[PDB]
Amino acid sequence: MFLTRSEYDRGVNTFSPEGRLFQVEYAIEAIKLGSTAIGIQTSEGVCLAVEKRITSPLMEPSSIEKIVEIDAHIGCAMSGLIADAKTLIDKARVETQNHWFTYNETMTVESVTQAVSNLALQFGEEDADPGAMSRPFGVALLFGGVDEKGPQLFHMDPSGTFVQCDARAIGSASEGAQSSLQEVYHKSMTLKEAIKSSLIILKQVMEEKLNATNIELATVQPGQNFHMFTKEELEEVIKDI
């Protein structure tokens, strides 16, 4: 009748007595050190709003952008380890262009998300291909685009699995943002009020002042390519909120 010490959370290939992989859980917990990102999917388009942290007035804001352009009709949002997301965005772009070259058409958001997720699955087996990575990625992504089925929004998890969400929030204040989203989202809504609600939630959750310089916004609409808001547009939409 003694109490002793047991350890199971120091290896990628170790099972807890209840069948739990703890390194993957820790990698998922690593996301909560990033910045909050919000994505709202609507029948008129997709909205992506993220908060950017500025460590000094001497930096260039246009160099730490957290919203990139995968293709002419697909966006992306990032949270977690920055260095890891750059090896996934490149894979997404390369896969999209390879598919276009082979089939003379454009991929779907689900296909792009699956292609990216096929790379995050492989880890822990260094005896395989030498380029394989020995630990899970520490970054979560939100995909937003328009295709034959209409506007779409997807979410991908360091575990290598993806689902489709009508409205998702990731980052440090994810739980509070999700709780606020659940009380305001309804299907029959417009892009303008989606933008307004996302901005309101961002203002509520941030620890700084929302002054149209510490946030960025982007939308995609049927018939128009991926578009990122400029300073004047941000000021106009941030006025009277």
């Binding site: 352009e69 490149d90 772009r93 390369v94 262009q97 390879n98 276009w100 070259f101 005896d127």
Partner: protein, 216 residues
Amino acid sequence: MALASVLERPLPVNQRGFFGLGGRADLLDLGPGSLSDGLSLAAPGIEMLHGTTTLAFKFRHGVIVAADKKVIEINPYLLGTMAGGAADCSFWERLLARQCRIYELRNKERISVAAASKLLANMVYQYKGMGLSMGTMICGWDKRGPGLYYVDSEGNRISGATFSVGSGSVYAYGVMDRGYSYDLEVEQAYDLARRAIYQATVNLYHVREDGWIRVS
């Protein structure tokens, strides 16, 4: 099969159906594969452009290219011409278009004419003597003004203000050499190109600041 998996080098001996010096080993894997891309090793009628004439020159307001399709629209801002093997031209220029799009996505800035021509020459130079046959003129406009280059399958890559390849190359080249002028208006340039291509024996393109257009 765990001891054989540790040795990270799959030999035919370790596989199944092995007897003698060979066996039922080369007759086992007969599937259609999963995913890759690669040309086959060396060991009918091949369509080739013979009776085609092309023309291209650059001036102050842009680049004008005419021909008798026979012009490949690589990009909204890049143009190309085929001469020789149609399949080779189409394939390699599709690869060039993909590379240009990758560059633009990565660097958030359009590629230049010199870089594109160098990339095409580098791709086609690896297979020297294998049997490829293509001749291309590449037109565009970038931060340094209009550009014009000539690339073929022999590794040649040159730049000039006036080029012509085809059956009636000599006559058209002489005509547009007689009538050439750098400080030329768009209408006079159109007239000169039309007259040269007429004397060579009709399409017509015009590259500007913000992409090419079709005249006729």
